[PDB]
Every structure is written in structure tokens, then in C-alpha cells.
């Protein structure tokens with residue numbers, strides 16, 4: 542076959558019931574995640590190949606960057622709670638990996654202030670139980686699939702993307718292979 546379990550994707554031995562359709566994990570400390578988001582725009586090319594109005598879900602993970610990595614997961618919860626993902630994804634990646642000016646929770650917050658989120662709004666969300674459950678949801682989702690590496694994408698709790706079995710001589714070909722596989726998997 543042209544798509545085979547073990548090549549473009551792997552199949553989970555313990556399926557995850559009731560999982561989100563397209564579920565993507567990343568870390569703002571992850572160099573490959575910087576690439577997927579800044580250079581390759583994986584998330585966005587995937588969305589463009591799925592049925593309109595499908596649920597793409599993206600979660601931060603804790604297992605990179607120690608204390609600040611956990612801070613970043615709470616800020617991703619804030620971002621999600623306020624719907625400002627599109628405003629802070631780029632500054633956050635660049636602050637962690639490009640300028641390396643994100644060294645503390647205060648520096649994370651600066652990204653939001655600079656992005657135009659009011660301090661009161663940020664601090665209120667940061668400290669809210671809505672954000673605390675949304676941290677919990679990100680952690681639970683990662684736990685369900687026993688996630689030890691990012692970037693990572695899962696379709697319907699059954700299929701994991703295997704980008705190691707795809708061609709990287711061309712950034713655009715790689716992306717489309719990736720997006721086409723997600724689409725094929727979502728139709729299975």
C-alpha cells in the first residue's frame with residue numbers, strides 16, 4: 542500500500558478513547574517544534590487539507606525546560622483560555638529559542654503584554670481555575686499516549702504521525718506528505 546502502519550505513521554497499541562480528532566503536542570523549548578511552526582507551518586497546512594470545521598487541538602508539554610517548561614504550559618493554557626494563540630505563538634518561540642530572552646514566568650508574561658493582552662487579563666487568567674483545568678487537560682492528553690517526544694500528532698487516539706518516514710530534501714514536499722497523511726488517517 543502507499544500508506545502503511547510503520548512508515549508514514551504508527552498505530553497505538555493502547556488506543557485512547559474519546560480523544561480529539563487531530564491532537565498535536567509541542568514545546569516552546571523543542572527545536573523541531575520551532576521548525577514545524579516557524580519554517581514549515583505544519584499545523585496550518587494540516588488544517589487546510591481537513592474537512593472544514595474539523596477540530597485541531599494543540600497542547601504544550603512539560604517534559605522539556607524543567608521549571609520554565611511547566612510555566613510555558615500554564616501560559617499556553619492562558620493563551621488558549623483567551624484565544625490568543627495566534628498572537629503569542631511566534632513571540633514565545635522566538636523568546637525561548639531565538640533571542641533567548643524568556644528566562645522566567647515574568648518574561649513569558651511580557652510576551653503577552655507586548656502582544657496586547659492587558660496585565661489584569663493575563664494575571665486573572667493565569668491564576669484561574671479554568672486555566673488550572675486546562676493545564677490538567679493538556680497533561681492528561683499527553684499522559685494518555687505516554688508522550689516522551691515532541692513534536693507529535695495523533696489522529697483519533699489511534700494513529701501517530703511518523704515524520705521519520707518522509708522526505709526532507711524539500712520543505713514543501715515534506716509538509717504536504719505530512720498533511721496528506723493526516724488527511725488519509727482522518728478518513729480511515
Ligand SMILES: COc1cccc(-c2ccc3c(CC(=O)O)c(-c4cccc(OC)c4)oc3c2)c1
Pocket residue numbers: 573576580581690691692693704705706707708709710711712713715
Ligand atoms: C525539509 O524541511 C525541513 C525544515 C526543517 C526541519 C525538517 C525536518 C526533517 C526531519 C525531521 C524529523 C525526523 C527525521 O530525522 O526524519 C523530525 C521529527 C518530528 C517529530 C518527532 C521527532 O523525534 C523522534 C522528530 O522532524 C523533522 C523535521 C524539514
